[PDB]
Design a protein around this ligand. Structure first.
Ligand SMILES: [Mg+2]
Ligand SMILES: [Mg+2]
Ligand SMILES: [Mg+2]
Ligand SMILES: [Mg+2]
Ligand SMILES: [Mg+2]
Ligand SMILES: [Mg+2]
Ligand SMILES: [Mg+2]
Ligand SMILES: [Mg+2]
Ligand SMILES: [Mg+2]
Ligand SMILES: [Mg+2]
Ligand SMILES: [Mg+2]
Ligand SMILES: [Mg+2]
Ligand SMILES: [Mg+2]
Ligand SMILES: [Mg+2]
Ligand SMILES: [Mg+2]
Ligand SMILES: [Mg+2]
Ligand SMILES: [Mg+2]
Ligand SMILES: [Mg+2]
Ligand SMILES: [Mg+2]
Ligand SMILES: [Mg+2]
Ligand SMILES: [Mg+2]
Ligand SMILES: [Mg+2]
Ligand SMILES: [Mg+2]
Ligand SMILES: [Mg+2]
Ligand SMILES: [Mg+2]
Ligand SMILES: [Mg+2]
Ligand SMILES: [Mg+2]
Ligand SMILES: [Mg+2]
Ligand SMILES: [Mg+2]
Ligand SMILES: [Mg+2]
Ligand SMILES: [Mg+2]
Ligand SMILES: [Mg+2]
Ligand SMILES: [Mg+2]
Ligand SMILES: [Mg+2]
Ligand SMILES: [Mg+2]
Ligand SMILES: [Mg+2]
Ligand SMILES: [Mg+2]
Ligand SMILES: [Mg+2]
Ligand SMILES: [Mg+2]
Ligand SMILES: [Mg+2]
Ligand SMILES: [Mg+2]
Ligand SMILES: [Mg+2]
Ligand SMILES: [Mg+2]
Ligand SMILES: [Mg+2]
Ligand SMILES: [Mg+2]
Ligand SMILES: [Mg+2]
Ligand SMILES: [Mg+2]
Ligand SMILES: [Mg+2]
Ligand SMILES: [Mg+2]
Ligand SMILES: [Mg+2]
Ligand SMILES: [Mg+2]
Ligand SMILES: [Mg+2]
Ligand SMILES: [Mg+2]
Ligand SMILES: [Mg+2]
Ligand SMILES: [Mg+2]
Ligand SMILES: [Mg+2]
Ligand SMILES: [Mg+2]
Ligand SMILES: [Mg+2]
Ligand SMILES: [Mg+2]
Ligand SMILES: [Mg+2]
Ligand SMILES: [Mg+2]
Ligand SMILES: [Mg+2]
Ligand SMILES: [Mg+2]
Ligand SMILES: [Mg+2]
Ligand SMILES: [Mg+2]
Ligand SMILES: [Mg+2]
Ligand SMILES: [Mg+2]
Ligand SMILES: [Mg+2]
Ligand SMILES: [Mg+2]
Ligand SMILES: [Mg+2]
Ligand SMILES: [Mg+2]
Ligand SMILES: [Mg+2]
Ligand SMILES: [Mg+2]
Ligand SMILES: [Mg+2]
Ligand SMILES: [Mg+2]
Ligand SMILES: [Mg+2]
Ligand SMILES: [Mg+2]
Ligand SMILES: [Mg+2]
Ligand SMILES: [Mg+2]
Ligand SMILES: [Mg+2]
Ligand SMILES: [Mg+2]
Ligand SMILES: [Mg+2]
Ligand SMILES: [Mg+2]
Ligand SMILES: [Mg+2]
Ligand SMILES: [Mg+2]
Ligand SMILES: [Mg+2]
Ligand SMILES: [Mg+2]
Ligand SMILES: [Mg+2]
Ligand SMILES: [Mg+2]
Ligand SMILES: [Mg+2]
Ligand SMILES: [Mg+2]
Ligand SMILES: [Mg+2]
Ligand SMILES: [Mg+2]
Ligand SMILES: [Mg+2]
Ligand SMILES: [Mg+2]
Ligand SMILES: [Mg+2]
Ligand SMILES: [Mg+2]
Ligand SMILES: [Mg+2]
Ligand SMILES: [Mg+2]
Ligand SMILES: [Mg+2]
Ligand SMILES: [Mg+2]
Lengths: 46, 77, 10
RNA sequence: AGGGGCGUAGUUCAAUUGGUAGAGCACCGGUUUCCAAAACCGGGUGUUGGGAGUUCGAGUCUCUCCGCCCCUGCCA
RNA sequence: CUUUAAUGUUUGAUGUUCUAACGUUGACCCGUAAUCCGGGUUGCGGACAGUGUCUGGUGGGUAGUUUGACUGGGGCGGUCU
RNA sequence: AAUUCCUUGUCGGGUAAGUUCCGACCUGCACGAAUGGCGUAAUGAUGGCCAGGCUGUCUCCACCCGAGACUCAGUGAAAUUGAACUCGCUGUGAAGAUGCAGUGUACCCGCGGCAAGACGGAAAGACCCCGUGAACCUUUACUAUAGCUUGACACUGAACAU
RNA sequence: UACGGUGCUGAAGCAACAAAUGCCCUGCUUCCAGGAAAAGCCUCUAAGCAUCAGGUAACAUCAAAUCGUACCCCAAACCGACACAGGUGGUCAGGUAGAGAAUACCAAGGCGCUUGAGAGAACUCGGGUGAAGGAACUAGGCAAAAUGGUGCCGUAACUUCGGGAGAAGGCACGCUGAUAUGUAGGUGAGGUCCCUCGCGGAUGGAGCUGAAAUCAGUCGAAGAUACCAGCUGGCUGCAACUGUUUAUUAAAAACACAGCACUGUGCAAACACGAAAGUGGACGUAUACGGUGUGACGCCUGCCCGGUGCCGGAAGGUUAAUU
RNA sequence: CGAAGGUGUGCUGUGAGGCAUGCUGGAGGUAUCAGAAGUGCGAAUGCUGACAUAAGUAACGAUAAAGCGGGUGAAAAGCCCGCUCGCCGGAAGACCAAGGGUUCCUGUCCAACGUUAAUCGGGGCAGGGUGAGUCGACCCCUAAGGCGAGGCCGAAAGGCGUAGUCGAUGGGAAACAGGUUAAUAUUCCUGUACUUGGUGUUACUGCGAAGGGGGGACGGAGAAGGCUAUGUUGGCCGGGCG
RNA sequence: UUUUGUAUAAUGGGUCAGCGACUUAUAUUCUGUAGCAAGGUUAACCGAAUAGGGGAGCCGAAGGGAAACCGAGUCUUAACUGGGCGUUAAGUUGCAGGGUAUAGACCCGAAACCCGGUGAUCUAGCCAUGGGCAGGUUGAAGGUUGGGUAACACUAACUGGAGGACCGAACCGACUAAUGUUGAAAAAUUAGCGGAUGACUUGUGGCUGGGGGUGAAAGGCCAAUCAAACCGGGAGAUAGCU
RNA sequence: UAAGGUGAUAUGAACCGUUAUAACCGGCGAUUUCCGAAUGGGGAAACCCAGUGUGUUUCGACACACUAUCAUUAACUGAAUCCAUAGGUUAAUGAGGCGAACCGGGGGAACUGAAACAUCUAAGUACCCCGAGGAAAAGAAAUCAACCGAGAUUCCCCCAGUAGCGGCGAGCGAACGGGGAGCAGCCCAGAGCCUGAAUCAGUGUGUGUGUUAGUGGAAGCGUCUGGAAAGGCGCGCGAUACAGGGUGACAGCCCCGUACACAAAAAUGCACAUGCUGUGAGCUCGAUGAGUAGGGCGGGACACGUGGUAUCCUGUCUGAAUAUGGGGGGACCAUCCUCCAAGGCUAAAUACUCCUGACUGACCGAUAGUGAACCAGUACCGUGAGGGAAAGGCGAAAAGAAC
């Protein structure tokens, strides 16, 4: 039965990719928080 | 935005009162109006977004004097 | 969590 | 059951709400009509559900008691 | 003092006509390779409309809340000095 | 009557017998005309009722074919669990006893079964109540408020007529 | 020669018929609900060149980079915590029977589903059959059983004339032979004429393919023999209907619905989303749009404006900021 | 010459306790009197870890089905080979996209992983394997839409939007058959082709835009006709005489 | 543990080990204790600095009265023989403790409110661009040819191929029953069932964001969560309750 | 600085060094792929696609450089429209982003408390946004006092839980004045006479003192137990060194250090001096911040909730005097004191610690202490934001067990 996750690389990068996140300050604040936390993977982009 | 180009008046916030003194947040905005002022020196009409209080000071101060301050302010009339 | 079906009295 | 309302002339209703109960119709009597009615004139009618009271005095005020209405009697 | 007739004044009330503020989601020109915008020309409207402050009305459209207790469970009824 | 409390109203039809159904009656507790009324072919995994066919649905189950259940080998959980040397009865007792009293019965221990009890397991009861708990929703509850609307002043001027 | 393989050689390699959902076809015909854009490409000339440049044509020649390319891909490799009876778009579409991509049996191809071996109890699950009765079961014919195809005959109330209707109900179906040794039909060679001449036309009928019907015979209990494949009728409530809905206990009489009416709205429209700009409404203009209620169709839709709203009026009473 | 710690034993106090010792361990410990507290645990459906119970019980994942011989091996119901049987065959076959990321091939191994064993595996380990002018992507082009110079608006942040610029699920140049690897192929090889640009030569010569026009360019349904894929039969070739 | 009351068939606990809850700051009152004493003591700060300096201040030795004021008295009243409150009685500064107050205030636990973000890879609607719907029926309008009319109308036959038309696979839906309920599966399987050229279905993108969306409307859906999503923060919210 | 050395798991191999070009440490440079403000365009970050110019040539190409936007300035051109202006093209500078807390400003809750709940409280807190610095802000009286005086601002202790505010409930809560820390005053609103005066900012030039590598650094033997001595038992010695760490059990004298004494080619901080480049000192005479103060209306800030409410800020509407004059002295008036707004600048005392060094602890000792003593913001979970673990110890030496 179809579940909530249907993979799509193009959709995933356009929604949460580095350029999509950094386009706006709110996403840039996510990067600032993850940089402050020391996350190994800042965004979802490979 | 709603900013007077002469006096610099900008929106401020306050309270609506009542007979029960209930306070609700509100905004006070300037009485801004777009007017075409005749500047004699350039023999031209220059349009300014001015408040009603700003209109009074233009007569008192002169059209040229206020613009001189505006150029110092870098407001880009 | 789950779906505790019931016969609650009424 | 429980709670509110009601009982006034022959039938339907006013009441004053402490000191003397009216209206409409009906009924009766007399006109008018060949006659009935319709119309006109005149008029008598009431323990104000029953009781016990309250008062100097109760159809009215209070409480029971009959009869007639109106509401409720619910959650599992 | 009244009755006040006229007299100037000071405020308003309408009505009419203007343009010059203001409006134009009319036309035309330019910025310009542009259905934006700005400027220009012109027409129309015009001291309105529209906006600000203040203010009366309206406003479950949207909020913040209240909506008692006793009680042979509660509610209803009754009660609270 | 998707509407009738009394109520299985009364009568008729259908049945051997029909509180349902169908037809009437009207006494409409408490139908009713676009919060539509009455009818209506067709349509309906629509509701109710009836008939034929059909059958293990049943009277009343029997046998058979497979998959489990059972035995062996291998692998190997789970919910639960104060501790147990964990019988019946009658009585008592936080008022329904394996555990108290009295009495009866019972060699020790598996396996296959059935679920009467352990107020069995599951989940700090959804019903009820309480808290000067929460939330949504309603309105002619209260107080506000967006919005809408009124006027004054400002943006906003001239002339003339009364 | 290492079961592989390697090397050499290698015949026929045609026709007819059937035939697509593929191609002609982005066609043709028809309908109303009236069915992208841009660039490449073709062409036209401005300004700017018109000796040049550039264009056209023919050769020669260079260049065509970079990234992906294994494998799974209806699944043990993806989404479901699992090597999970679930889900997941496109392309390909063999033979016999059949209308068919249904279904049954097979081809190509791929598999036997990662615990078995015994036993052959109760009981449970999935099935088979059943004397007699045939809904007596049960809330209820739940379930099961039954019906089931093609051709033909025949088919009621009612109806909006379309329906109802596959109404109901019934008959014939195999095989063999004959009509007719393989028919009607379809396809169509050779041959023979014609051509301003070809992938030609007209004759022509060989050879293939091939129902359907009738008659005769024959077997069985049974010939739509398996799989596949409507139960039917009668009364009535509700909703007109197809549709939509509570993903995960409710598919309905609920919602929607066409239709009807009221009301708002003159277009810088009402309204709505937006502090605003603006956008939708609409590149529409009252034969339009929004809101509300009702809900096809047929016959119809009565009385009340006191209450509450809404609309109109504006004299008077009352009344804010302001003065 | 054996500290704490642990584990026994003995003694002792009204108690929380204390003292001593045997063994374990192998380096710290600490009198007394004061001082300070993360100072004393059985419970909180407490928290974390470990281990029980049910229990060798349920289950071992579609009732499509297996059997035998041989091989390898320490060991074979499960692997390999062979012969049968059974299942799918509009799929349970074949090729892709999306998605995964080496699961592909070979060698090697059986701890763990596989609901059993396992010599086997999508397990572990080590190597190998993905070859493009024509297939895609990239590229050119645009849809919805996104972003958006200036601009308009907005307390700030920002919102909207013009010119523009992105954005395929659409529109745009060209390759087929055969062979070959343990694993790749319209990519490699063989044979035979094609396309778009660049440059040069030769001949003939009006070219030219961000501009114009054409084209690209488009629905639903239905009806046939002409075909092919494909299938059948015959013929032909080869083999067979059961 | 909670109760008038529990062997209770009321709650808790499978067991062990570890962890786990009366603390801290400031101020105030009371007790104990120490120092000084009608006095006591410093704070900040200075300072080689736990000393010393710093008496700024604080408390006490005098109260009465609303207050001005008066004062061992004073207020009340015109005034008190009066009456109320006072006048003999040591306090103050440390330390410890018992309390209180403000802070989370012993610990664990809400349903919620508010703020800023993340989500339409599920689903709902919409937008753009593509795809899918075997086969078999019914035979509308229209058209042609007749018959009929002056011409129609009308009628017959033949062509035609209309439909939210019919039967029925793919596809989509999910009505009944059985199984399954610590499942093969956190909604499925088996046998039947409805739609199946359309208000159909589907792929790939896009858009609408939380008091908001979207909704052929069920308070449905908005990432297994919806009468107000998720994440973080306010926050150790609050909890007269367990 | 050096006799050893090629980072770690983590050996090995092949080597480099040994008296000074091994290595190591520090100063200064060189190089510094791709993404990222990312800046040539685009983009699903670490990729795709260019243009211009210079220089290369094997005629296939190749190598560098430049090309974002905005602000400011200056040139050149350039509409409607004659000049102009808008606009356009260049060239120079500057800004973009990141980062803990602290700071200023623009916005700004609710839970909660009030045993409910509106005013109020929570709270101008949380949070969002803008901007800046090493501090920031504030700051040189239109201030307070009270008839005596004080003399900018900031911070601490008092004043004082006082005066007051407050459904006068909950609660909120000063000032005057005093004691301290630290102190600093100036400029413009204009012209002269003087004159480059003081002072400040640039820079060089030295000195002093740091910082970024380093150098030396005292003094014990014997015996006993024991695997091993730093322990026991003896006898010494150093100490401006008995701080610590390590060494086979507890080391003043074994080692590293420590106390002391020293060190810088180069870079750099700080301070003083000095030289240039700006910068103006002093004197006289003037001038003395107007849509402002004030007022009406609506709010906000002052402890102060409109109250009798001064004072401050202003959204709105008005509107002075101006030194012969104004402001304030908590309604208001008079008197008297005090000050001079409507222009600016200003160190110190104050707040904080992402980071660097040293040191300290009646702080923890692997369920504790940071979530993380371990390759931890990892594995893992979630579409995403986000959430988020478990896991330390052989022995002195691996001598890690040949056979
Ligand atoms: Mg109820
Ligand atoms: Mg409300
Ligand atoms: Mg509240
Ligand atoms: Mg009560
Ligand atoms: Mg109560
Ligand atoms: Mg009834
Ligand atoms: Mg009967
Ligand atoms: Mg009936
Ligand atoms: Mg009705
Ligand atoms: Mg009606
Ligand atoms: Mg029905
Ligand atoms: Mg029957
Ligand atoms: Mg027992
Ligand atoms: Mg008993
Ligand atoms: Mg018993
Ligand atoms: Mg049983
Ligand atoms: Mg049982
Ligand atoms: Mg129980
Ligand atoms: Mg409850
Ligand atoms: Mg391949
Ligand atoms: Mg392959
Ligand atoms: Mg699968
Ligand atoms: Mg799951
Ligand atoms: Mg998985
Ligand atoms: Mg699918
Ligand atoms: Mg099939
Ligand atoms: Mg059996
Ligand atoms: Mg059964
Ligand atoms: Mg059967
Ligand atoms: Mg049989
Ligand atoms: Mg039978
Ligand atoms: Mg029989
Ligand atoms: Mg029966
Ligand atoms: Mg029965
Ligand atoms: Mg049935
Ligand atoms: Mg059947
Ligand atoms: Mg029928
Ligand atoms: Mg009925
Ligand atoms: Mg319906
Ligand atoms: Mg339907
Ligand atoms: Mg459901
Ligand atoms: Mg659905
Ligand atoms: Mg259902
Ligand atoms: Mg309706
Ligand atoms: Mg009506
Ligand atoms: Mg009315
Ligand atoms: Mg009226
Ligand atoms: Mg011992
Ligand atoms: Mg040791
Ligand atoms: Mg503790
Ligand atoms: Mg328990
Ligand atoms: Mg267990
Ligand atoms: Mg077993
Ligand atoms: Mg058992
Ligand atoms: Mg068993
Ligand atoms: Mg079993
Ligand atoms: Mg299996
Ligand atoms: Mg074998
Ligand atoms: Mg088969
Ligand atoms: Mg691997
Ligand atoms: Mg393999
Ligand atoms: Mg093994
Ligand atoms: Mg592997
Ligand atoms: Mg190639
Ligand atoms: Mg390639
Ligand atoms: Mg191609
Ligand atoms: Mg934009
Ligand atoms: Mg911009
Ligand atoms: Mg593009
Ligand atoms: Mg594409
Ligand atoms: Mg067409
Ligand atoms: Mg063919
Ligand atoms: Mg007891
Ligand atoms: Mg018990
Ligand atoms: Mg002292
Ligand atoms: Mg003193
Ligand atoms: Mg006295
Ligand atoms: Mg004391
Ligand atoms: Mg105390
Ligand atoms: Mg249909
Ligand atoms: Mg149907
Ligand atoms: Mg169908
Ligand atoms: Mg959901
Ligand atoms: Mg809410
Ligand atoms: Mg939260
Ligand atoms: Mg808080
Ligand atoms: Mg709490
Ligand atoms: Mg760039
Ligand atoms: Mg409260
Ligand atoms: Mg600095
Ligand atoms: Mg040294
Ligand atoms: Mg002055
Ligand atoms: Mg003023
Ligand atoms: Mg005011
Ligand atoms: Mg007051
Ligand atoms: Mg007063
Ligand atoms: Mg005031
Ligand atoms: Mg430990
Ligand atoms: Mg830890
Ligand atoms: Mg911790
Ligand atoms: Mg551990």
């Amino acid at each position: 039965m179809k579940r909530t996750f249907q993979p799509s690389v193009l959709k995933r990068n356009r929604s949460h990719g580095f350029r999509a996140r950094m386009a706006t300050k709110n996403g840039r604040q996510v990067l600032a928080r993850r940089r402050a936390k020391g996350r190994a993977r800042l965004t979802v982009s490979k | 935005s709603r900013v007077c180009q002469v006096t610099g008046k900008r929106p401020v916030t306050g309270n609506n009162r009542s007979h029960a003194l209930n306070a609700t947040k509100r905004r006070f905005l300037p009485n801004l109006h777009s007017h075409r002022f005749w500047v004699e020196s350039e023999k031209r009409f220059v349009t300014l977004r001015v408040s009603a209080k700003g209109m009074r000071v233009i007569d008192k101060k002169g059209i040229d004097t206020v613009l001189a301050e505006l150029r110092a302010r870098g407001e880009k009339y | 969590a789950a779906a505790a079906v019931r016969n609650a009295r009424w």
